[PDB]
Each structure stands twice: as C-alpha cells, then as structure tokens.
Symmetry: C5
Subunit: 103 residues, 5 copies
C-alpha cells in the first residue's frame, strides 16, 4: 500500500496533486436528484467536487464517497488546513480522490 | 458538473437562491410518523424545510437527504454562517435542495 | 408541511408542547435488549424518553428515531438549550416526537 | 418504560450499577477479527467492555451496540463525567448495558 | 475478553504494540478505487494504515474498519494523544488492529 498521498495519487491515471496548504473557503452541499454532491472552493479560486455516485465507481467506493463528504464538512467547520488534494483532472470541476492534512 | 450552488440551482425548475449570509436562528427536528423532517428558521423570518422522504425522491437522494439533516444540525450548533440556500418554491415552507457556507 | 414545532405537534393526537428553555440535566443511554432507548431529564424534574423501536413505528421513523437519539447526545454534550419538546403523553415517561432549539 | 438507569438495570439479571462519577481514563478500540470491541478504564482501576456482537445479542441490539461505542468515544474525547454504568457482571471485564451522565 | 490493548494484541500473530504517546502528525484519506484507506503518520516518522477492506477481513470487521477510520479522523482533529497502536507487521505500512488513548 502507498505511504503518502502523492504515492497513492501516482497509482492512477488523469490525477495530479494540488498543494493547497489552506483551510476551505466555501462548502457547498446538494441533495438535488442527480446532483448529490459536494463542492469546495479555496481562496486561490480553485474549485473541487466529490462526484455524484455513478457507474465510474466500484462498490468499495460507495462508503468512501460518503466518508470524503463527511470529512470535507468537518474540515470546513473546524477551519482545518488541508495540505494536499489528489484530484482527477478529466472532470469539471476537478474531482477529489484523496485528501491530506498536516498539523 | 456545476461549480457553484447558483449554477447547480439553475439546473432545476421551481428553484431560487436565497442569499442568507447568517447563522441559523432555530432548529426543529421531528421523528413523528409522516413528519420525519427538519425545519430551520432565520432572523429574517424565513423558514425552510428538508422534506419528508417520499415518491418525489429518487434512490440516490435517500442518503443525501440524511446528509442535509446532519449538516443543518451541526451548522446550527456551531453557529456557522450559511451563505446561500437553493430551495424549491413549490413547497411550504420552501424545501432545501442545496446549501453553501463561506469562511 | 408545518412551519414550527408547535404547528407540527398539533397534527397529532395525545401530544403537547413542553416549553423547556434549558439545557439537558442528565442523559441516559441503554443498549440492553428490549430497552434500547434514551432517557433525558431536566432541572425542572421532568423526564422524557425516545421509545424503544416497536410496532407503533412506521418504516420511515426508524432512521428518525436514531437521529433523535443522536441529537439528544450532542445537545447534552454541548450544553445546548432546548427550547421546546413535542411529546406523546400516553407513555411513561412522556415520549419525544420533536425537538426545537433557539439561538 | 424505566425512568432512570437504576430502574432499567433492575429489569435484568446479572447486572449492577457502578457509580463512577468520573471521566474516562482510557479508551481502547479494536477492529481485529473476533475482537471488534471497545474497552474503557477509570482512575479507580475499573475496566469495562462493550462486547463483541454475538449470539447473546438480539437484532434490535446491533445498532445500539454501535451507538454505545460512539458514545464512549465522544464521552472520552470531551472529558465528560460519566455518572453511572449498568453492567453485566457475568463477563470479564464487566460488560456495559447502559450509561448515564449528569450535568 | 482482553482487558488492555496489549493483552488483545497478544491474541494474534504478526502483531506488535507501538507505544506512540503522541498526537497524529498527518491524516491522509483516499476514496480512490481499490485504495479506500486511511494513512496516519507521526513526528517519529512512523507511518500506519487502515487497510483497504478485502478477503483478509471477516464480516464482523466491516463496521469496525469504518469505526477505526472515524476514530483516526476525530483523533487527528482534536489533537488527541494516542497511547498505543496494535498493528500487523506483515503489511506496508503497518496495519492498525487496535488503538488506545489515555487522559
Ligand atoms: C483511467 C480510467 O479510465 N479509469 C477508470 C477505470 O479504468 C480502469 C483503469 O484505470 C486505472 C486508473 O484509474 O488509472 C489504472 C490504475 O492502475 C488503477 N489503479 C489501481 C491502484 O488499481 C485504477 C483502478 O483500478 C480503478 O480506478 C478502480 O476502479 O484504474 C484503466 O487502465 C483500464 O483501461 C482499459 C479499458 O477499460 C479498456 O477499455 C481497454 O481495453 O484497455 C484499457 C487499458 O487497460 O480500465 C480499468 C477498468 O476497466 O475504471 C473505473 C471503473 O472501474 C472508472 O471508470 C475510472 O474512471 C475514473 O473514475 C474515477 C472515480 O473512481 C473518476 O470519476 C475519474 O474521473 C474517472 O476517470
Ligand atoms: C419539475 C418536476 O416536476 N420535477 C420532478 C422530477 O421531474 C423530472 C423532471 O424534473 C427536472 C426538475 O426537477 O427540474 C428537470 C431538470 O432538468 C432535472 N435536472 C437534472 C440536473 O437532471 C431534474 C432532475 O432529473 C430530477 O429532479 C431528479 O429527480 O428534473 C421534469 O422536468 C420532467 O417533466 C416532464 C414530464 O414528466 C413529461 O410529462 C413532459 O412531457 O416532459 C416534462 C419535461 O420536459 O419529469 C421528470 C421525471 O421523470 O422528478 C423528480 C423525481 O423523479 C421529482 O418528483 C421532481 O419534483 C421535485 O422534487 C424535489 C425533490 O427532489 C422537491 O420535492 C420539489 O418540490 C419537487 O417539485
Ligand atoms: C393517536 C394514535 O393512536 N396514533 C397511532 C397511529 O394511529 C393512526 C392515527 O393516529 C394519528 C395520530 O397519531 O395523531 C392521526 C393523525 O392525524 C396522523 N397525523 C399525520 C400528520 O399523519 C398520525 C400519523 O399518521 C401517525 O402517527 C404516523 O404513523 O396518526 C389514528 O387516529 C388512527 O385511529 C383510527 C383507526 O385507524 C381506526 O381503525 C379506528 O377504528 O378509529 C381510529 C380513529 O379514526 O389510526 C392510525 C393508524 O392506522 O398509528 C401509528 C402507527 O402507524 C402509531 O400506532 C400511533 O401511536 C403512537 O405512536 C407514537 C410514535 O409514533 C407514540 O408511541 C404514541 O405514544 C402512540 O400513540
Ligand atoms: C439472564 C440471561 O441469560 N439473559 C440472556 C437472555 O435470556 C433471556 C432472559 O434474560 C432476561 C434477563 O436478561 O434478565 C430476563 C429479563 O427480564 C429480560 N428483560 C426484558 C426487559 O425483557 C431479558 C431480555 O429479554 C433479554 O436480555 C433481551 O435479549 O432477559 C432469561 O430469563 C431467560 O432464561 C430462561 C431460559 O431461556 C430457559 O431455558 C429456562 O428454562 O428459564 C430461564 C428463565 O426464564 O431466557 C431469555 C431468552 O431466552 O437472552 C439474551 C439474548 O436472547 C442473551 O442471551 C442474554 O444473555 C446476556 O446477554 C447480554 C447482552 O445482551 C450480556 O452479554 C450478558 O453477559 C448475557 O448473560
Ligand atoms: C496469521 C494470518 O494469516 N491470519 C489470518 C487469519 O487466519 C486465521 C488464523 O489467524 C489467527 C491470527 O491472525 O492470529 C489466529 C488467532 O488465534 C485468531 N485470534 C483470535 C483472537 O480469535 C485470529 C482471528 O480468528 C482471525 O483474525 C479472524 O479473522 O486468527 C490462523 O492461525 C489460521 O492459520 C492456519 C491455516 O489456515 C491452515 O491452513 C494451517 O493448517 O494452520 C494455520 C495455523 O494454525 O488461519 C485462520 C483462518 O482460518 O484469517 C483472517 C481472515 O479470516 C485473515 O486473513 C488473517 O490475515 C491477516 O488479516 C489481518 C486483518 O484481519 C491483517 O490484514 C494481516 O495483515 C493479515 O495477515
């Protein structure tokens, strides 16, 4: 298994590490049908999503998708600095694969 | 996928953006049969619901409805300022589709 | 849909509004078989339960029962003032149908 | 339904009330197979478990077991004083049936 | 049942106690397919994982794996000092079996 977010991110195609080093500026959550998703933005202007669950996801990802949304909300609310995001860059906005935080 | 709440809200009919820019004044939660719902009010006087799950909801929305209720409670309790709500205006009170918070 | 706890509470029989305006004094939680329930008391001496799930509950209430117990715990722990409780008065102690909090 | 932890505890065999009146000293959580359990200790030296789910549990207890572990963690982390524990004394360490907290 | 993390850890093969006595330095969470996992590091330079769920896990562990990831996040966020980790040493990085915290 990978030992860092960067190492994990390299195990995939169409991914890149964004070094954020900042707390989340805005949190957006939708329960509208077909748009069950979370959107986060930063001071940098960069916007990121957790995608709507769909056929691009395998079973093992369903709970992890829910976990990521849980993490984004509590990260937002505690003003916790996110270190890095591993994101897929074939989606608009870029889609969150992994998150890291340092303290 | 949409990049902001406003953009997401535009992908639906009978929706409008309320710019709230305030913490939640009151939180009401019900486990009474056929009224399994949350109601939030603001200082502005405006009241909003998360609807009882029903036939107007698709399967993908069940977990998101529960998420929205989770978010409203923790938002309330932390006195977090809500920025915008995307709501359906063909329900009374208006029904929450999406929420945003800025920091 | 109702716009306030009081309005919601009036849609049912054997219910009444208790104006609490206080934080929870004691929180009791049981995982003993047939007594999977939460009990709360106040400084006023009044005691309230979330009933054990049973045949008086419809399916849509299962998740809401669990939510109400979640809310009672976090409310207790944060010393959050409860405003009102809608309770069923044909149970001993009185059984929680809805809760409100103002800030 | 019972109105206090003590009253609830008396509806069972092999149970006793421990008056703790203290915050949790240590929290131990295991995800090892056949040892999916939580252990808590106190300054008094007394140790308590939430048992591994097994055939001694009825269906209605599955969620309540998970709730009890949730409560123990958040209680530990907030340094919340536990008042009383209703425990089964036919297990080693004694097994948690109910918990109460006063404020 | 075991009464301490050390005692529990001894009921398994390929395990060892790491005495950490420190808060978590970094928290990494991934929802990428086949890498649904959490990684934590410490100031000591030691890295640990909660493994991706797979055939090495029995059914009773599914909920416990999710709980462990919940605990790591909230532990990280509250800067709570971990005391000990029971870890499997036949995985890279070492894989978390149990955790303890003292206060
Ligand atoms: C790049 C891509 O299409 N990914 C989609 C994936 O396709 C699989 C293979 O992609 C990789 C990858 O994601 O980069 C290759 C990695 O080595 C794998 N990494 C690890 C650590 O296992 C991952 C991983 O297995 C999956 O992501 C987990 O589900 O997959 C890709 O190389 C392979 O391509 C085949 C192709 O299918 C076939 O038509 C052609 O004949 O040959 C190609 C070259 O071999 O296909 C793999 C699956 O068959 O498939 C998943 C569903 O399994 C998704 O569709 C994924 O798309 C991304 O999904 C993300 C969410 O998980 C997110 O939405 C991204 O935006 C999507 O692009
Ligand atoms: C307006 C309406 O009745 N919406 C109900 C919806 O109906 C479907 C179509 O809905 C839209 C919409 O809701 O605005 C159109 C959007 O482009 C869609 N957006 C996206 C991003 O896909 C949404 C979305 O797919 C759904 O909301 C997700 O469930 O749907 C609606 O336009 C369509 O109307 C047809 C009509 O049926 C047909 O006779 C006629 O010839 O063509 C019309 C369009 O040209 O019907 C669609 C259903 O097949 O359906 C959902 C559940 O399926 C809801 O019932 C929705 O009502 C709202 O539900 C909300 C909660 O999700 C909330 O309760 C609101 O108050 C409800 O009005
Ligand atoms: C009062 C009562 O007995 N409630 C039980 C309920 O019975 C149903 C009807 O009750 C009402 C009510 O609770 O006030 C009537 C309301 O208008 C309804 N309000 C709304 C917004 O929907 C509610 C609501 O539907 C339910 O609470 C949700 O399940 O129900 C009751 O009037 C009706 O009695 C009829 C009977 O059906 C008929 O055959 C007889 O001959 O005459 C009566 C009078 O016309 O029966 C309804 C059910 O068929 O049913 C639910 C289960 O669905 C429960 O059993 C409920 O008991 C309460 O449950 C609470 C928690 O949910 C709590 O434990 C209380 O202590 C219980 O009394
Ligand atoms: C004491 C005991 O062995 N309990 C096990 C239980 O057995 C049932 C009866 O237990 C009581 C009890 O716990 O004291 C009696 C109480 O009045 C009941 N209280 C309420 C509110 O219902 C409880 C309760 O029903 C259950 O605990 C909920 O699951 O049960 C016990 O009296 C009865 O014993 C019979 C025996 O079966 C029969 O052969 C003999 O002829 O007469 C005896 C006296 O009537 O059996 C009852 C069920 O068959 O069953 C549960 C699960 O079904 C557990 O096995 C329980 O063991 C405890 O489980 C705890 C966790 O829930 C914990 O791990 C303890 O360490 C276990 O002892
Ligand atoms: C060492 C190993 O490979 N363990 C895998 C396990 O194998 C079972 C036995 O493992 C023990 C153990 O892990 O120490 C023995 C303990 O006494 C048990 N402890 C308790 C408290 O009950 C545990 C426990 O029951 C399991 O973890 C339950 O999930 O298991 C192992 O001794 C036994 O090996 C046999 C072999 O099968 C047989 O061919 C040969 O003739 O004799 C051997 C030695 O007597 O096999 C047992 C299974 O039948 O199986 C589990 C899944 O059931 C895992 O695969 C486990 O591998 C580890 O899994 C961990 C996560 O759970 C982690 O990822 C580690 O990295 C894996 O090594």
């Amino acid at each position: 298994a990978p030992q860092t977010i960067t190492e994990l991110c390299s195990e995939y195609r169409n991914t890149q590490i964004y070094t954020i080093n900042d707390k989340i500026l805005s949190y957006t959550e939708s329960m509208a049908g077909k748009r069950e998703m979370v959107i986060i933005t930063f001071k940098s202007g960069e916007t990121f999503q957790v995608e709507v669950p769909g056929s691009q996801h395998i079973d093992s990802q369903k709970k992890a998708i829910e976990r990521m949304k849980d993490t984004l909300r509590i990260t937002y609310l505690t003003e916790t600095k996110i270190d890095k995001l591993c994101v897929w860059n074939n989606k608009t906005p870029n889609s969150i694969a992994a998150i890291s935080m340092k303290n």
